[PDB]
């Protein structure tokens, strides 16, 4: 009977494959074959933030596109004011193995988690004026790879136990559990409307969930190795994934298929970070060869290089207004490019 | 004016945070974190001395942080990269399915990893008494066919002197690890193998000496002497 179920699943996968093949009629490159190229744009290191001791695993921009938060393996969480290159709120962490950090949309809270299998929520503004652990969430049996604030009262986390969880910060309990990933989830990205979110895991698959009840609407399988980073298109109808097979891919919703892959022959290092520009024309991908490649998302031709680091980048982000891009690195340096 | 006022307030807050941060840097520099890794749960990592476990111990007024992985899945492909900056990886192997082959494969994967290529390994061979009991009693020979051709090295220095067969087996296992260590990498990181009987307190001294040698080699590499 197990063999019968395996045959049933294989037949269903084949049927989905034929449905996708019938859906595809013309590649995205053919559509954007007459589009004027970007023009080989170059961006210099506008600023360098150098307050961390150990490698920087994650950083997240604020809503105002002025304040950012960075987490480093020296157990440090620093909120930089990028305009005046100043720093505020150097938050010490209970566990020094933080691997992710998030900034609340309202700007009132900061999340961080790591090898402790726990997500700590810190209240930025207090009557005492000192940042303290507002709440500790521990419903994960594996390391927290990513976390994102939903509405300043709910948080979505992905862990190394192959599960995602939507929490309630007030009650400190798991509200919803998203399951279906084989490999541990490495990254997640919220939709602009906060109605859906995509998650990329250690398997080649990426799954799209809806936070209201979380039943894994769609699954995309185009990569060949672990999906390290995921980012969501500004219009909300597409997303981009970066994997360890040294390729980036652009999937789209409501078509359940690949659109275009970004890769080069002389690239043999995996992707660690992926982000989109304000209009979505540019796709910024961080690499393991200490460089950041800026791709024309419509033509899959390299448009820029951002080689300002000494070690792997491991994190990058673009401001809400698209003014500047911040890249962290394992050399304990943050760089703001514009 | 508001703008100079808030700029001054932000600058003084930055100065205070800078003071606290240099104070924290002083503590962080003199710590020498280590990663205590074991092939399986059978290995007696605990007596060597959720999510992650911390152990603080001082040797000759030198602080040491040992991190033991707890509530994590068996797939260590991703989170092991968090330990590329540790001073050493204390790899504990029970020298008593073929668990030895699994330990060898794990050691090879750790040694040949791209991000751990600069991290040194302190190899501990536990279950020495168990290995002696198994060797004297009438599974090592069949698991490793090359053991028959193996001969005890000249610098065996068998201090316990329990048998000329136990020493041969333990040195065969040590050479099995050293083959990978020497072949895969040269001039970047070093492997320090030791025999432990799990009833001795000298393990922390051996770890201290190996860490001293590791940092000496790292400093020597700055001048390209090594």
């Amino acid at each position: 009977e197990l063999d019968q179920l395996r045959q049933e699943a294989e037949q269903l996968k084949n049927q989905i494959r034929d449905a996708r093949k019938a859906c595809a009629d013309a590649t995205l490159s053919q559509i954007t074959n007459n589009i004027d190229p970007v023009g080989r744009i170059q961006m210099r290191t506008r600023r360098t933030l150098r307050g961390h001791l150990a490698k920087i695993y994650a950083m997240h921009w604020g809503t105002d596109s002025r304040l950012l938060v960075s987490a480093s393996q020296d157990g440090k969480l620093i909120i930089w004011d990028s305009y005046t290159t100043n720093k505020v709120h150097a938050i010490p962490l209970r566990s020094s193995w933080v691997m992710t950090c998030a900034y609340a949309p309202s700007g009132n809270y900061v999340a961080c988690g790591g090898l402790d299998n726990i997500c700590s929520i810190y209240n930025l503004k207090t009557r005492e004026g000192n940042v303290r652990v507002s709440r500790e969430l521990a419903g994960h049996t594996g390391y927290l790879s990513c976390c994102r604030f939903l509405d300043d009262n709910q948080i979505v986390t992905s862990s190394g136990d192959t599960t995602c969880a939507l929490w309630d910060i007030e009650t400190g309990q798991q509200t919803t559990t998203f399951t279906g990933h084989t490999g541990d989830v490495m990254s997640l990205s919220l939709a602009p409307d906060t109605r859906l979110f995509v998650s990329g895991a250690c398997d080649a698959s990426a799954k799209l969930w809806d936070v209201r009840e979380g039943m894994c609407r769609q699954t995309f399988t185009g990569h060949e190795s672990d999906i390290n980073a995921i980012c969501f298109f500004p219009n909300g109808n597409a997303f981009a994934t970066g994997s360890d097979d040294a390729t980036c891919r652009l999937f789209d919703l409501r078509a359940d298929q690949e659109l275009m892959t970004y890769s080069h022959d002389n690239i043999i290092c995996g992707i660690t970070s992926v982000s989109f520009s304000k209009s979505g024309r540019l796709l910024l991908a961080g690499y393991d060869d200490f460089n950041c490649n800026v791709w024309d998302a419509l033509k899959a031709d390299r448009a820029g290089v951002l080689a300002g680091h000494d070690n792997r980048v491991s994190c990058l982000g673009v401001t809400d207004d698209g003014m500047a891009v911040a890249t962290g690195s394992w050399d304990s340096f943050l760089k703001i490019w514009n | 004016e508001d703008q100079r006022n808030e700029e001054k307030a932000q600058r003084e807050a930055n100065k205070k945070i800078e003071k606290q941060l240099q104070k924290d840097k002083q503590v962080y520099r003199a710590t020498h974190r280590l990663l205590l890794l074991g092939a399986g749960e059978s290995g007696k990592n605990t007596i060597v001395k959720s999510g992650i476990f911390e152990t603080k111990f001082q040797v000759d007024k030198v602080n040491f942080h040992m991190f033991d992985v707890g509530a994590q899945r068996d797939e260590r492909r991703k989170w092991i990269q968090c330990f590329n900056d540790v001073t050493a990886i204390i790899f504990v192997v029970a020298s008593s399915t073929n668990r030895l082959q699994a330990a060898l494969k794990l050691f090879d994967s750790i040694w040949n990893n791209k991000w751990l290529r600069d991290t040194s390994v302190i190899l501990f061979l536990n279950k020495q008494d168990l290995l002696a009991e198994k060797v004297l009693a009438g599974k090592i020979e069949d698991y490793f066919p090359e053991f028959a051709r193996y001969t005890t090295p000249e610098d065996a220095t068998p201090e316990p002197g329990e048998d000329p067969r136990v020493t041969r087996a333990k040195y065969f296992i040590r050479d099995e690890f050293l083959r990978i260590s020497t072949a895969s990498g040269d001039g970047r990181h070093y492997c320090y193998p030791h025999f432990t009987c799990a009833v001795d307190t000298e393990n922390i001294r051996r770890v201290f000496n190996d860490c001293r040698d590791i940092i000496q080699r790292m400093h020597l590499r700055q001048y390209e002497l090594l």
Partner: nanobody
Amino acid sequence: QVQLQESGGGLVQPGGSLRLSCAASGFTFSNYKMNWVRQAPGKGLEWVSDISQSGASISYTGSVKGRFTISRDNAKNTLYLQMNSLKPEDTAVYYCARCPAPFTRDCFDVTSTTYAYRGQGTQVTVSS
């Protein structure tokens, strides 16, 4: 998607010969190092052998060193394991595993349970 399908191997008399063929799809075969692992009844996954890209770095576990041989055809996108002298204690489910990262001399967690880039496996039983 990454799909590894193993074929061959049934009931074989002790001392007999067998051939296991692993067909791979969804990735560039030549970029990855391949592995053969096995799981005995009630024993857990154990590593049997591995071969690097384009061969030339073959290695086996000690138990099967003199008997089993592993080869690969990059053009045919296939992995082969020949078992020329079977013994009763190697009755197991055999899996074709593809290591997680391309262009890597190291590769992790093939023997770990719930591993993504592993096939369904074939039963190989040796008995009278």
